[PDB]
From Swiss-Prot, chain A:
Protein name: U3 small nucleolar RNA-associated protein 12
Gene of this entry: DIP2
Note: Present with 9620 molecules/cell in log phase SD medium.
Organism per entry: Saccharomyces cerevisiae (strain ATCC 204508 / S288c) (Baker's yeast)
UniProt-listed SUPFAM superfamilies: Nucleoporin domain, WD40 repeat-like
Entry keywords, A to Z: Nucleus, Repeat, Ribonucleoprotein, Ribosome biogenesis, rRNA processing, WD repeat
From Swiss-Prot, chain B:
Subunit structure: Component of a heterotrimeric complex containing IMP3, IMP4 and MPP10. Interacts with snoRNA U3. Component of the ribosomal small subunit (SSU) processome composed of at least 40 protein subunits and snoRNA U3. Interacts with the SSU processome subunits EMG1, IMP3, IMP4, KRR1, NOC4/UTP19, NOP1, RPS4A, RPS4B, RPS6A, RPS6B, RPS7A, RPS7B, RPS9A, RPS9B, RPS14A, RPS14B, UTP1-UTP18, UTP20-UTP22 and UTP25.
Similarity-based family: Belongs to the MPP10 family.
Functional note: Involved in nucleolar processing of pre-18S ribosomal RNA. Required for the early cleavages at sites A0, A1 and A2 during 18S ribosomal pre-RNA processing.
UniProt name for this protein: U3 small nucleolar RNA-associated protein MPP10
Compartments, record wording: Nucleus, Nucleolus
UniProtKB/Swiss-Prot annotation, chain C:
UniProt superkingdom: Eukaryota
Subunit structure: Interacts with snoRNA U3. Interacts with MPP10. Component of the ribosomal small subunit (SSU) processome composed of at least 40 protein subunits and snoRNA U3.
Full-sequence portion shown in this chain: 585 to 817 of 817
Stretches of the chain forming a coiled coil according to its record: none
Protein known as: U3 small nucleolar RNA-associated protein 13
Something else known: Present with 8070 molecules/cell in log phase SD medium.
WD repeat ranges, renumbered to this chain: 1-30, 32-69, 79-120
Subcellular compartments: Nucleus, Nucleolus
Function text: Involved in nucleolar processing of pre-18S ribosomal RNA.
C-alpha cells in the first residue's frame, strides 16, 4: 500500500484552445492540458507552465477528470492572463509572480470566449451555455448576467462600457445595451448557426456554414430597429468549410480562419467593391487558431496552431498591391516536444530511457531526467514497440506487413525485414535473454524469429484457426500466451509448442495478457469491461472484476508481487491488488482514451499515453401571520410618518433593498398572507395596529393605482377590521381619524361605483346583442 | 362554460383562465411547467 | 435535371417525386384525373410536363421562393418580437398591443392591458391611441380578443380588465358588425353570466361601504 502521483507531462503542445501572441518574434501563449504553455518562437523551449497545487491521484483528488483549459486571454500591460476551463470556472494568473489569485464560477459548461478590459478592470465571458457574464476584478464579483441566446455564445464583441454584440449557435445577432441593461436588437444572420463575428468600427463581418459571410454596418441612430444594424453586403465562395474566426489588422486587412486547413486573408480598400481577397495560407494539418502581427505594412506575420501538436509560423512580404509570394514562409515550426499524432506503444528501458511510438512511425526517445527528446525516426503506421536490452535497441511492429528495428546510437535502419506478414502484425514479445522474438499477426500467424549476429531470421511460424491480438512470453520463459480474435487465450509450452492449456469465457476478444513473475497467475483483459484473473496451474478462473466502463485497454503487473495496473478508453488508471482483489487507487489524470501503458522494470513509475498526447510518469511514496403583518405595518408606517414630518419641516434597509415604496411593501405582505390565516391574523392585532392599518389604507387611497390594483383584498380587510374593532373605534374621539374615515369612505365608494358602472354597461350591451341576434337569425 | 386545455398546441390554458404561449415563455418557466405537468400526470 | 429528385408518373393519374438517395417519396402531385401516359422534363428551366389519357395537360416547376418566403417570415417574426420586448420595456402600449395582437401572446397582451389600465387610472377608456387601435381592429382580431376577454372574465381577478376591454369594444365598434360576425354569439353568451356574478358581488361591497358610513355616523353622534 503506497501512493504514486504523476511527475511529468510530455507532448502537451497544442491543446483545444486559442493561442495568444505576445510581442518581444515575441513569445507565444497557448493552452496545455490542465496547464498553460508559454514559449519563445526562435527557440521553442517551454519557458514556464502553470498548474494547480494538487497532483492528480493524490489523497485530495476527486473521482473525475479535471477540466481542461478551453479558453484564455491576457493583457500584457496589466500582465493578467484569464483562463476558462471546461466546467465553467474562470481563474486568472499573473505572469511575473506566476500564480492564480482569484476564481469565479457562474457558468455550467465549457467557456468559449473570454475578453477583459483592464482599463475597466472587468471581464466578459461567454460560455457554451446561454449566459454572458460580466465580472469585475477589483470588485471581484459578477456585476450582472446577460442571457437571451439559447444555444451558446460563439461570436462576441464589446464597445467601451456601453454596447455589446453577440451571436450564437442559433444564428441570431443580439445588440445589447449596458445602461438599459437588456437585449435590444436581434437579427437572424444565417439560416443555420452563425459561427464567426468580427467588428470593425464601421462594419462587422459574420460567417456561417457554407462560406456565407455577411458584411453589415453599425451606427448609433436612434430608431427602434433602423440605423443600429443593416444587411448591407453578402460575400460567398471563400471555401466550402464553415468559417471559425475572423480578426482585423491595420498598421486594412483581416483574416478568416476556417476548418479546412486554410486561412484566407482579405483586404479592404458591392461585396466585390468593398472587399479584396488578398491571399490564402494553407497547411497540411487541420488548423486550430491564429493571430496576426505586422510592421510598416510591408510584411504579414501570422502565428498558427493546429489540431496536432504543431505550432506553425507564417510570413509574407508584400507592397499593399501584391502578396509577392505564391506560398508563405514557414520560418518557425515547433513540433519536436510533441508526437504529431496519437501514440500507440510505450516501452521503458532498465536505464529508464522512455520510448514512444505512434502513427507516423515517429519513434521518439525521451527520458525522465531531462523530459525532452533524444532522437526521432519514422516508419509509417507503427503499432507496437519493444526495447531490447542488449545494445538498448528498439523494434517496431507496424500495420503494414513489415517489422523494423532502430538504434539509439547509430541511424534508423540497421535491418528492416519487410513482407513479414500479409495483414497487420499486432503484438510482439521477446524472450528474457533477448535471443528469440515472437510476433502475433492478423494472418493468424505466430512467427518465431532468432536474433542472428545483426539480422533476424524466422526459425518457425505457427498457424492458428483464428486471428491474433496479443502475445506474451513468460518472464521465466516457460509459457507463451496468445489472445485470439475469439474469446480464447491459448497457453503453450515455450520449448516445444505443446498446446498446454486454454482459457475461455470473455464473450469478447481479449485485448491484453500478462502473467506473473513466478508464473502462476495470468491476468486477461478484453473489451467486456471486466478483468479476469486465472491460475495457470489448472486453467481456472480465480476471479472476475468488473471495472473501466468502456473497455480495459491494457493491464500490467508489478515485478515485486501480484499488484497490477489497468487502463481503459474511458480515461481512468486503476491500481489493484491481486490477492485482496480490490482497487487500491483510482487515478484520473487525463481525459481521452488511455492507449498505451508501461510500468517501470524495477521502480514503480508508470507512463500512460492517452489519445490527447499524454505521457505520465507515475512515481511513488419563521414568524406567524399577524406577526409579520404587524412588523411590516410598523416599518412602513414609521417610514410614512417620518416622511410626513420631513414634509412639514420643509413647509429602511429592507425598503431600499427590495426597492418598494412602503405602501407597496405592506400590500405585498398582505398579498403574501393566506385567507384561512388572514381571519385570525386580522383578529389578533391590538387597536394601535388597527389605527396604523387605517392610516395605511388612507395612504393607499392617496396612491389610487395600488387601490385599483388590489380593490377587493383592501375592502375585505378593512370591513372585517372595522366590524371587529367597531366598539372601541366608535368609542374613541379623534378628528384626524374622522377625516381619514371620510376620505376612505368617499374614495372606496367612488371606485366601487366605477367598476359597478363598467359591469352594468357591459351586461346590458351584451344582453342587447344577444337579443338582437336572436330576433334576427333564429327562425 | 367550463375551461379546458386550449385548441392550439402553441398555447397552454390552465384551469384558472390564464393562457400561455409556448413562445413568449422563458426557459426556466418552460422547465417548471413541464415539471408541474409531469407530477400531475404521475398522480393521475 | 437536378438529378437528385427522380420523378415517377403514374397510371392512377398522379406524379410522385423522391430524392434518389433517400428511398422515400418526397412530394406528391395529383393534377390529372384518370390515368397518366406522357412525362418529360425540360432541363435549363427544370419543368416537368405531363399528359394523361384525357386531352388535358400540365406544366410543373419547383420554386425556392417558398424557402425565401419562410426565411423572410421568420426574420419578420423575430424582428417584431424584439420590437414588442422593447415596447414592453419602455411604453407605447398602443404599439405593444398591435404587436401582441399580431403575435398572439396572451400573457404579454394581458400585461400590456394591465399597464394601460394602471396608467389610465390618472369619454376616455384607455390611452386614446390604444382606443383607436381597438376601433381599427379586424374581425378575426375581434374574435380572438373576445375569446381572451372571455377567459379573463372567467377569472375573478382579471374581470376588471375584461370588462374594460369589452366596454371599449362596444363603445368603438358597430353592433351590427358584432351581430353579423360569425361565431360571436357563443362567446357573448359565455361572457354574460360571469359579468352578472361580478356585478352582484360589487353591489355587496358597496353595501359594506355604507357600513363604513354607519361607523362614521355613530362616532360623530357620540362626539
Amino acid at each position: 500500500y503506497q501512493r504514486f502521483e504523476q511527475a511529468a507531462a510530455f507532448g502537451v503542445i497544442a491543446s483545444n484552445a486559442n493561442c495568444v501572441w505576445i510581442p518581444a518574434p515575441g513569445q507565444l501563449i497557448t493552452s496545455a492540458l490542465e496547464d498553460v504553455n508559454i514559449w519563445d518562437i526562435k527557440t521553442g523551449d517551454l519557458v514556464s507552465k502553470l498548474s494547480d497545487g494538487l497532483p492528480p491521484g493524490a489523497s485530495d483528488a476527486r473521482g473525475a477528470k479535471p477540466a481542461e483549459c478551453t479558453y484564455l486571454e491576457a493583457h500584457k500591460d496589466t500582465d493578467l492572463l484569464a483562463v476558462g476551463y471546461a466546467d465553467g470556472v474562470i481563474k486568472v494568473w499573473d505572469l511575473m509572480s506566476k500564480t492564480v489569485l482569484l476564481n469565479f464560477n457562474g457558468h455550467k459548461a465549457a467557456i468559449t470566449l473570454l475578453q477583459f478590459d483592464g482599463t475597466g478592470t472587468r471581464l466578459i465571458s461567454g460560455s457554451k451555455d446561454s449566459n454572458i457574464i460580466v465580472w469585475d476584478l477589483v470588485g471581484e464579483v459578477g456585476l450582472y448576467k446577460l442571457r437571451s441566446h439559447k444555444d451558446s455564445i460563439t461570436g462576441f464583441w464589446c464597445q467601451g462600457e456601453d454596447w455589446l454584440i453577440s451571436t450564437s449557435k442559433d444564428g441570431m445577432i443580439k445588440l445589447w445595451d449596458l445602461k438599459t441593461h437588456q437585449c435590444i436588437e436581434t437579427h437572424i444572420a444565417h439560416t443555420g448557426e452563425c459561427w464567426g463575428l468580427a467588428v470593425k468600427d464601421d462594419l462587422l463581418i459574420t460567417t456561417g456554414t457554407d462560406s456565407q459571410v455577411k458584411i453589415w454596418k453599425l451606427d448609433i441612430e436612434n430608431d427602434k430597429m433602423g440605423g443600429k444594424l443593416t444587411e448591407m453586403g453578402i460575400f460567398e465562395k471563400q471555401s466550402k468549410q464553415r468559417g471559425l474566426k475572423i480578426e482585423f489588422i491595420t498598421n486594412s486587412f483581416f483574416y478568416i480562419q476556417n476548418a479546412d486547413k486554410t486561412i484566407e486573408t482579405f483586404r479592404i480598400r458591392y461585396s466585390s467593391f468593398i472587399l479584396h481577397p488578398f491571399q490564402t495560407i494553407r497547411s497540411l494539418y487541420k488548423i486550430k487558431s491564429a493571430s496576426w502581427t505586422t510592421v510598416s505594412s510591408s510584411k504579414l506575420e501570422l502565428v498558427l496552431t493546429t489540431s496536432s501538436n504543431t505550432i506553425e509560423y507564417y510570413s509574407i512580404p508584400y507592397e499593399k498591391r501584391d502578396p509577392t509570394s505564391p506560398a508563405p514562409l514557414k520560418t518557425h515550426t515547433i513540433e519536436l516536444q510533441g508526437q504529431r499524432t496519437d501514440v500507440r506503444s510505450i516501452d521503458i528501458s532498465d536505464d529508464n530511457k522512455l520510448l514512444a511510438t505512434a502513427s507516423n512511425g515517429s519513434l521518439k526517445i525521451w527520458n525522465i531526467k531531462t523530459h525532452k527528446c533524444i532522437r526521432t525516426f519514422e516508419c509509417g503506421y507503427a503499432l507496437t514497440c519493444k526495447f531490447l536490452p542488449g545494445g538498448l535497441l528498439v523494434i517496431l511492429g507496424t500495420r503494414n506487413g513489415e517489422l523494423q528495428l532502430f538504434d539509439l546510437a547509430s541511424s534508423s535502419l540497421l535491418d528492416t525485414i519487410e513482407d513479414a506478414h500479409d495483414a497487420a502484425i499486432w503484438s510482439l514479445d521477446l524472450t528474457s535473454d533477448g535471443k528469440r522474438l515472437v510476433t502475433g499477426s492478423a494472418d493468424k500467424t505466430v512467427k518465431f524469429w532468432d536474433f542472428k549476429v545483426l539480422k533476424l531470421h524466422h526459425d518457425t511460424t505457427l498457424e492458428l484457426t483464428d486471428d491474433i491480438l496479443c502475445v506474451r512470453v513468460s518472464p521465466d520463459d516457460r509459457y507463451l500466451a496468445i489472445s485470439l480474435l475469439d474469446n480464447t487465450v491459448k497457453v503453450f509450452f515455450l520449448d516445444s509448442m505443446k498446446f498446454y492449456l486454454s482459457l475461455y469465457g470473455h464473450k469478447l476478444p481479449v485485448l491484453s495478457i500478462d502473467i506473473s513473475f513466478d508464473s502462476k497467475m495470468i491476468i486477461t483483459s478484453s473489451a467486456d469491461k471486466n478483468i479476469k484473473i486465472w491460475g495457470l496451474d489448472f486453467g481456472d478462473c480465480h476471479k472476475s472484476l468488473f471495472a473501466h466502463q468502456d473497455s480495459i485497454m491494457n493491464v500490467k503487473f508489478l515485478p515485486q508481487s501480484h499488484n497490477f495496473f489497468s487502463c481503459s478508453k474511458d480515461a481512468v488508471v486503476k491500481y489493484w491488488d491481486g490477492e485482496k482483489f480490490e482497487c487500491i487507487q483510482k487515478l484520473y489524470a487525463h481525459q481521452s482514451e488511455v492507449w498505451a501503458l508501461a510500468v517501470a522494470t524495477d521502480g514503480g513509475f508508470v507512463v500512460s499515453s492517452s489519445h490527447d498526447h499524454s505521457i505520465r510518469i507515475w512515481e511513488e511514496t419563521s414568524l406567524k401571520a399577524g406577526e409579520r403583518l404587524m412588523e411590516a405595518l410598523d416599518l412602513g408606517i414609521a417610514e410614512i410618518e417620518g416622511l410626513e414630518a420631513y414634509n412639514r419641516d420643509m413647509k429602511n434597509a429592507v425598503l431600499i433593498a427590495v426597492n418598494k415604496t412602503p405602501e407597496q411593501y405592506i400590500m405585498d405582505t398582505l398579498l403574501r398572507i393566506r385567507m384561512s390565516q388572514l381571519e385570525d391574523a386580522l383578529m389578533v392585532m391590538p387597536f394601535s395596529y388597527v389605527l396604523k392599518f387605517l392610516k395605511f389604507i388612507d395612504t393607499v387611497m392617496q396612491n389610487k393605482t395600488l387601490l385599483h390594483s388590489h380593490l377587493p383584498l383592501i375592502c375585505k380587510n378593512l370591513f372585517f377590521i372595522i366590524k371587529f374593532n367597531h366598539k372601541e373605534l366608535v368609542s374613541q374621539k379623534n378628528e384626524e381619524l374622522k377625516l381619514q374615515i371620510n376620505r376612505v369612505k368617499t374614495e372606496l365608494r367612488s371606485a366601487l361605483k366605477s367598476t359597478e358602472d363598467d359591469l352594468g354597461f357591459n351586461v346590458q350591451g351584451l344582453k342587447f346583442v344577444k337579443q338582437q341576434w336572436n330576433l334576427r337569425h333564429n327562425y | 362554460y367550463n375551461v379546458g386545455k386550449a385548441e392550439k398546441d402553441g398555447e397552454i390554458r390552465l384551469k384558472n383562465g390564464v393562457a400561455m404561449s409556448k413562445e413568449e415563455l422563458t426557459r426556466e418557466d418552460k422547465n417548471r411547467l413541464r415539471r408541474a405537468l409531469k407530477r400531475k400526470r404521475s398522480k393521475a | 435535371n437536378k438529378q437528385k429528385q427522380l420523378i415517377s408518373c403514374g397510371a392512377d393519374g398522379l406524379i410522385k417525386i423522391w430524392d434518389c438517395s433517400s428511398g422515400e417519396c418526397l412530394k406528391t402531385l395529383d393534377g390529372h384525373n384518370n390515368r397518366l401516359w406522357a412525362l418529360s422534363t425540360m432541363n435549363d428551366g427544370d419543368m416537368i410536363v405531363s399528359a394523361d389519357a384525357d386531352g388535358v395537360f400540365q406544366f410543373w416547376k419547383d420554386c425556392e421562393q417558398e424557402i425565401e418566403e419562410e426565411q423572410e417570415k421568420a426574420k419578420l417574426q423575430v424582428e417584431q418580437e424584439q420590437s414588442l420586448q422593447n415596447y414592453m420595456s419602455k411604453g407605447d402600449w398602443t404599439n405593444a398591443f398591435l404587436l401582441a395582437m399580431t403575435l398572439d401572446h396572451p400573457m404579454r397582451l394581458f400585461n400590456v392591458l394591465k399597464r394601460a389600465l394602471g396608467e389610465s387610472r390618472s369619454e376616455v377608456i384607455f390611452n386614446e391611441e390604444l382606443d383607436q387601435a381597438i376601433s381599427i381592429l379586424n374581425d378575426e382580431q375581434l374574435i380572438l380578443l373576445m375569446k381572451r376577454c372571455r377567459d379573463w372574465n372567467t377569472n375573478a381577478k382579471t374581470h376588471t380588465i375584461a370588462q374594460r376591454t369589452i366596454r371599449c369594444i362596444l363603445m368603438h365598434h358597430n353592433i351590427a358588425k358584432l351581430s353579423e360576425i360569425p361565431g360571436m354569439v357563443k362567446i357573448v353568451d359565455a361572457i354574460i353570466p360571469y359579468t352578472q356574478r361580478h356585478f352582484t358581488r360589487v353591489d355587496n361591497l358597496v353595501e359594506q361601504s355604507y357600513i363604513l358610513d354607519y361607523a362614521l355616523v355613530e362616532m360623530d353622534k357620540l362626539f
